Ligand binder design. Structure first.
Ligand code: NA
Ligand code: NA
Lengths: 214, 46, 47, 213, 211, 230, 213
């Protein structure tokens, strides 16, 4: 309600954070980071088991994910093992780098929001004290300063840092799926049976964060 | 650790708390208002 | 950086500060008490 | 209102911590960490002295511990030293990873709890300062601020951080025990003297924090 | 609010502590490199890549490119020119890191001087207490010190350090790219293969977001 | 000026001690700190750490100069110090150089790890004391706010609750952390002394020249914090 | 007025002294103080002056302790290992001395704000408990404010800048010692002056001095 909303406080916090962030990230970089965050929040990463099932279902014959779309299209084009390896590792590194940079953008935002809140609360306290003949009606004058501090804390702890953490988790999942799809495409190019590759495909599915799931 | 803005926030908050204690030292509190506040706080805390 | 408990220190300080502002909300100034306080503060800071 | 304030403070602190942690870790990760913490707090690590006595008994002969069961099963299958060592090292690394990730989950809880406490405190303080003219309003708001700060402090310092420390201690004990089993199984496969391996294993009794003699 | 005395206090204290950390000449060098990173633009990698391609086809505004071309023209070998270019790159990296350090030190020392100034002002007002109506506004001007420090620690010094680090990374990328271009030119490679190798650098540690 | 600094440090400790003493406020801090610390160190480990701290504070270390004097006296020949006594007994009984080196390095590592564990115990106490003080303060604040009867008692009761926080600070910066720092200093001193004794014992066993080993031992004395003392 | 000022000074300075004396021995502190005094009342030698003196000596074949040590060692010790080892030992000794002085002063500046916070809390408790005697809250407020101010000033304007200046002096001294060692090695090997001048040119622009050029 109207006690928790202040135009000047949100303006100070948002403008200061945007200024400081644009001192290290261009507008295109920030927009790409927001696009990556929206993709990671509104879309679900493909299940590795479903990916393995799709790989083994399409292996014996010789389509939803774009990575395996590109893989099968380029294999149809008929390139070499060095070509497929180079292109797929390049795509993996590219995706990892943009995810890391989006994490950096949102972490810079989360680090700079509470400093802007401190600046805003200092401005509010100065404004309160400059008009204090008697300490009677200074409650609402302090409310705006604590409001700027609260805005900084909320944006830092409940918005920007969770977005960065979700981007990190999405980067991990995307890297795992990319490695799985690369291995499947290499196996299909070689022409092995579907059963032999599945023996080692899921050996390292318990890597890192998933180690607690067993 | 913790960011240094938190330390500046703590230092400023304690400093101004000292100032407000000084302000209360030479101020007389209303008795009826204090009784109302005390009753409300007791009710809220259970 | 700072000790991990500095956040709780800032929270406690803000709590006490805002309680004191609440107490000041219904307080009335005293001229003679202010004069005594000012004299004591002048004495303490060596003026 | 008396119970409503407590409910609101608990909701703020716990719900915020859970929401923030579930972004860092998947729900399955949180459940696994909870299970590992419960196992560390309800079950006792096996004493290395009993482990040494049992393993020198088996060396003389040439088993409730699961790692010993796996090592003995690998050894009786006639596998090479390298394969068995690699498998047991993989198991040790897996246990290390699980314990480290559980400690990380509880550390995330511990450093997110005071932030939620601060958010709730500032909310309560703003609400109390704004409603100065309403005595019925500042009571619940001041209570919410105080209780949310207290809950953040208590949950961070007396629940989540000590649970992480307990998990680290359990990880250290499990690593020591599994390394002891590694060395003893290697010695049994090689067939060294039981007294020499007993002395070398007793040498492990003064490692880390066990210096209480 | 606006107060010349408070900004003077903060700036003077920070300057004193930094001059105890660095020297005055190093401070002036840091200011010069910060200015060059602010009012000038780093050369875009695409233009440099096109320039390497054009010189390869035919066989210069960048000073590093001019130095490489001159070191090639007087019949030199790969290792000596490589060592010279590595030395120049390391010198630029060191200069940028030192400037970042100077502005980081300013940023960490500004808020402490702000707190010292406001505490001194509060002590003065407490020792000179005359009128109750003036106990409030007095601390206002005192707090003006802290605010200033905060602002200078977050809108000026730390952003300048971040901009210096960004320009350091951009210059390192450009000079490494010019290194590979000059090595290719002295190796006599095809323009197309070196062109592809050079565009391989266009998805570096910060330009992947715009892709 | 050394006496003046010692006196002012003692006076600061004394005034902090009388400010500390009140019983309940420190009791809550120490109870919470002990409860938190016992999930990292067992009761026996805590008692061992307290014994190490006491032995480091009361009993003074041997001056390395006297150690070098004794070592060179024994070398020219052909003891209250326990490590030196063990080394002398081991070399008199007759053993290889490798066995002596292994045993002496084992003892050195044991003392190093014991002192590191004690330092960790007291540093954990130092980290956890202020948070427990603040928790006690917030509990006292809740008790006060739920028991408002007289405005005149708002001030003193507040000063009581905040008191707990004070104790935490005084217990963190003036007892536990200084004890950990003194334990680290004692660890460094005992490691240096034991390394000197090991080198001297090896030199005596191998029949080295007294002059070269004396030069080596002076070189050992001329490093570490002792570099400030020259 | 004297009592509250000396109480604040006693709290801050005496507490810092007690804690640091727990950290460092008194002799080490006095050595650190002498090192800082030398670094504040004696300008470092210009490395260009050292290069000019070195080339003058090389062409030919005082006022510097290291140079006197080097020439005394060269006129008697004909080998290279002894001279090089002695020079490296002196360099390491000076580095250790300056590092320990930096450590002493950084410890002082670390402990000062903790004592300031303790003093603020003590003054707050006293002023809250009294709260009614004007003669009792003036001194308490004075103690709180002055402990905070003294801690801040001593930490950020005395001890930390002294440690930073000691680091600067260590870097300058180490650069000069390397230059003198290289000059001695060149004059022992009979190198041409021009090549060693070109080789010390890159020594000149090492690290901080890169900003001047
Ligand atoms: Na203060
Ligand atoms: Na004040």
């Amino acid at each position: 309600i109207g006690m928790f909303v202040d135009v000047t406080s949100i303006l100070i916090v948002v403008g200061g954070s945007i200024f400081v962030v644009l001192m290290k990230f261009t507008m295109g970089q920030f927009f790409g980071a927001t696009k990556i965050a929206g993709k990671a929040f509104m879309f679900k990463a493909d299940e590795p088991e479903d990916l393995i099932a799709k790989i083994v279902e399409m292996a014996d014959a010789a389509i939803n994910n774009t990575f395996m779309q590109k893989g099968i299209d380029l294999l149809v084009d008929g390139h070499d093992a060095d070509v497929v390896r180079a292109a797929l590792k390049k795509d993996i590194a590219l995706t990892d780098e943009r995810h890391t940079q989006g994490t950096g953008v949102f972490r810079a935002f989360g680090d700079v929001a509470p400093a802007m809140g401190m600046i805003g609360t200092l401005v509010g306290l100065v404004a309160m004290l400059s008009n204090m003949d008697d300490p009677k009606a200074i409650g609402p004058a302090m409310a705006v300063a604590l409001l700027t501090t609260l805005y900084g804390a909320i944006l830092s702890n409940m918005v920007f840092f969770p977005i960065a953490d979700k981007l990190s988790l999405r980067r991990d999942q995307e890297t795992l799926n990319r490695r799985l799809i690369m291995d499947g495409v290499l196996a299909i190019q070689d022409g092995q049976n579907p059963r032999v590759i599945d023996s080692y495909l899921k050996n390292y599915l318990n890597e890192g964060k998933r180690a607690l799931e067993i | 650790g913790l960011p240094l803005w938190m330390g500046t926030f703590a230092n400023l908050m304690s400093l101004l708390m000292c100032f407000f204690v000084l302000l209360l030292s030479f101020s007389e509190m209303d008795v009826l208002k204090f009784k109302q506040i005390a009753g409300s706080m007791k009710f809220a805390f259970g």
